Swiss-Prot record, chains A, B:
Biotechnology note: Overexpression of this protein to provide quantities adequate for medical use as a topical microbiocide has been attempted in a number of systems including E.coli, Lactobacillus jensenii, the yeast Pichia pastoris and Nicotiana tabacum; see PubMed:20162270 for a review.
Keyword Disulfide bond: yes
Record-given protein name: Cyanovirin-N
Any GO BP: regulation of defense response to virus
UniProt keyword terms in alphabetical order: Antiviral protein, Disulfide bond, Lectin
Organism: Nostoc ellipsosporum
Function: Mannose-binding lectin.
Native organism taxonomy: Bacteria, Bacillati, Cyanobacteriota, Cyanophyceae, Nostocales
Record GO terms (molecular function): carbohydrate binding
Subunit structure: In solution exists as a metastable domain-swapped homodimer which very slowly converts into a more stable monomeric form at room temperature. Under physiological conditions it is unlikely that the dimeric species exists and indeed the monomer is more active against HIV. Interacts with HIV-1 gp120.
InterPro entries reported in the protein's UniProt record: Cyanovirin-N (IPR011058), Cyanovirin-N_sf (IPR036673)
Length: 101, 101
């Protein structure tokens, strides 16, 4: 997994946002960023990777109306139920960029 | 907090990625996306907002060499200490776009 530095360049960190220019699979480049605020955490002074289970335990995501995410998710008893969350709670528009605060 | 809805149009979810087109602080529009793989978590069937204390508890972030992030973070005891993590463990260049996997 990982290894972006092998095929990307001119990276920069700004607060918690990583930005870099990376080789596409066609042969040109693209510049994107990814906010690390929700990818890593601080356990007693040490940075570590924050895991999540959305992608492995939920399926069939959909946008309901303007801002509501609907999906099906596995429960402790190992079935799938329907669940919904309002993305407006914590997803903001910060100057034309979607952010999680 | 959040409320991206009120100033974005054409929002879409695909997989765990949300895309929307949002207004800039003063006209102009930008389309952008955020990968919810790391912002949401399933607890017993329900989509939950995943917290991280990185922003809240660390500072002085910095890229060192080509892939290490360095920062100082508070121990549970409230002291700052420097710490570092290799972004290459899990930051990938996926066809020109940085992803956390
Ligand atoms: C293009 C219309 C020009 C007039 C709008 O002016 C607003 O007034 C304030 C000055 O900054 C500010 O509240 C607004 O910034 C808000 O909305 C713009 C989008 O039009 C954003 O670019 C900016 O980040 C800020 O967004 C926040 O509030 C929004 C709800 O109104 C919400 O949609 C976002 O998630 C942010 O929380 C704007 O400049
Ligand atoms: C002129 C010949 C190039 C033809 C394309 O094939 C390449 O070689 C491999 C095919 O088996 C393949 O691994 C390569 O893919 C990756 O690299 C490109 C950019 O070079 C990315 O766009 C793509 O997402 C994928 O990135 C991954 O590989 C890198 C390690 O090389 C790493 O830096 C990234 O983080 C990803 O792990 C290419 O298609
Ligand atoms: Mg997270």
């Amino acid at each position: 997994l990982g290894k972006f530095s092998q095929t990307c360049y001119n990276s920069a960190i700004q607060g918690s946002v990583l930005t870099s220019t990376c080789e596409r699979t066609n042969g040109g480049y693209n510049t994107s960023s990814i906010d690390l605020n929700s990818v890593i955490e601080n356990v007693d002074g040490s940075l570590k990777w924050q895991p999540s289970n959305f992608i492995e335990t939920c399926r069939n995501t959909q946008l309901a109306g303007s801002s509501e995410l609907a999906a099906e998710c596995k429960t402790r008893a190992q079935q799938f139920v329907s669940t919904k969350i309002n993305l407006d709670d914590h997803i903001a528009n910060i100057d034309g960029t979607l952010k999680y605060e």
